[PDB]
Amino acid sequence: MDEIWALYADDGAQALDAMEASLLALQAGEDAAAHVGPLFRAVHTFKGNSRVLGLSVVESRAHLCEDLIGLVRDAGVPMDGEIVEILLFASDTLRAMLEETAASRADVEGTGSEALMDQLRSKIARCSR
Amino acid sequence: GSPYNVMIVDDAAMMRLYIASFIKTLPDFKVVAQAANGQEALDKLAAQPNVDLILLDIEMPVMDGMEFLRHAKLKTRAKICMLSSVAVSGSPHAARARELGADGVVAKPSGTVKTGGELARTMRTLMAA
Ligand code: NA
């Protein structure tokens, strides 16, 4: 089990690095066309990794991020400044969850990220009314 | 014959390790190759003609001329089982698997909510067919 936990931390860091890079590029004024795919793939990878290890609370945060990014990719919602903002907050939150869970070899307590969940659910509802 | 030689093809390193670790516990299958992309899969397969069973991510993009899947289907006698990230029931994955020439499809295992019971059963059914 040492090896899979090591890989969770390493692969997770690469995925979150890619998530953050795409979001920072968008914040700097690069076009969504170049970044929504990489962003989706990074979040999807992070989600799948957490699912492998049964980390359902971590998984649920990544899943809601993926839903929001999917609305942009598939349902014609623009990648507006608010989406970018919420996902940057999500990337920081996921990074803290990664560092903690990798070390506890267990799922996180959801309390600290309930605010993020509310923000994601709110943006999802508002831009897909 | 015994054990059956398995190749795992999935771009997710966590899924390759998880499935490989599980196959270590089956006396009737061993892993002989793992690959993260189509060209690597071709490289390992073309060099390792004793492969009996290929487990292939249904989410992995096909090569532009589908050289890996074509080689596997047309130049080897390996059985091919697609791996799906969602429940197969209610998905398009069972139909997509048949269309691609795969011999079966099964949901990827997880440490979530036994562990590879369905996977082992499917692998065995395929080799006994
Ligand atoms: Na654009």
What is the Cα–Cα distance from A3 to A21, expressed in whole angstroms? 27
DSSP 8-state assignment for residue B109: P
Q: Cβ contacts of residue B18 below 8 Å, gap of 6+?
A: A4, A52, B109, B110, B111
SS3 B79: strand
Q: Per the CB < 8 Å rule, is A11 touching B18?
A: no
The experimental technique behind this entry is X-ray
Region of residue A105 (phi > 0: left; psi between -120 and 50: alpha; otherwise: beta): left
Per-domain boundaries in chain A: 1-129
Query: Three-state SS for B44?
Result: helix
Q: Could you tell me the two tokens for B16? A: 């390759």
Residue B88 token pair = 């197969």
Of the candidates B49, B26, B40, the one whose C-alpha atom is nearest the C-alpha of residue B115 is: B26
Burial (0-12, 13-18, 19+ Cβ within 10 Å), A43: buried
Q: Are B14 and A11 in contact (CB under 8 A)?
A: yes
State the best of B8, B14, B16, B113 to mutate against chain A, taking most chain A CBs within 10 Å.
B14
**Sign, CA torsion A10/A49/B59/B41:** positive
Structural domains in chain B? 1-129 (3.40.50.2300)
Beta strands across the sheet bearing B104-107: B29-35, B4-9, B53-57, B79-84, B104-107
A45 and B12 within 8 Å at the Cβ level: the answer is yes
Ligand 1 centroid–CA A16 distance in Å is 23
Domain A1-129, CATH among 1.10.40.30, 3.90.960.10, 1.20.120.160, 3.40.50.300: 1.20.120.160
If DSSP codes are grouped into helix, strand and coil, which group holds residue B45?
helix
What separation in Å is there between the alpha carbon of A42 and the centre of ligand 1?
20
R_g over Cα of chain A:
14
Residue tagged 């914040």 (tokens): A27
**Token pair in block for residue B84:** 């799906």
Sign of CA dihedral A11, A81, A114, A73: negative
Angle made by CA atoms A105, A108, A112, in degrees to the nearest 5: 150
Question: From the CB of residue A122, how many other CB atoms can be counted at a distance below 10 Å?
Answer: 12
In angstroms, the CA B124 to CA B104 distance is: 11
DSSP string computed for A62-115: HHHHHHHHHHHHHS-----HHHHHHHHHHHHHHHHHHHHHHHHTSPPPGGGGHH
A104: phi then psi, degrees, rounded to nearest 5: -80, -15
Look at strands B79-84 and B29-35 and give their pairing.
Answer: unpaired
Centre of ligand 1 to C-alpha A43, Å, is 20
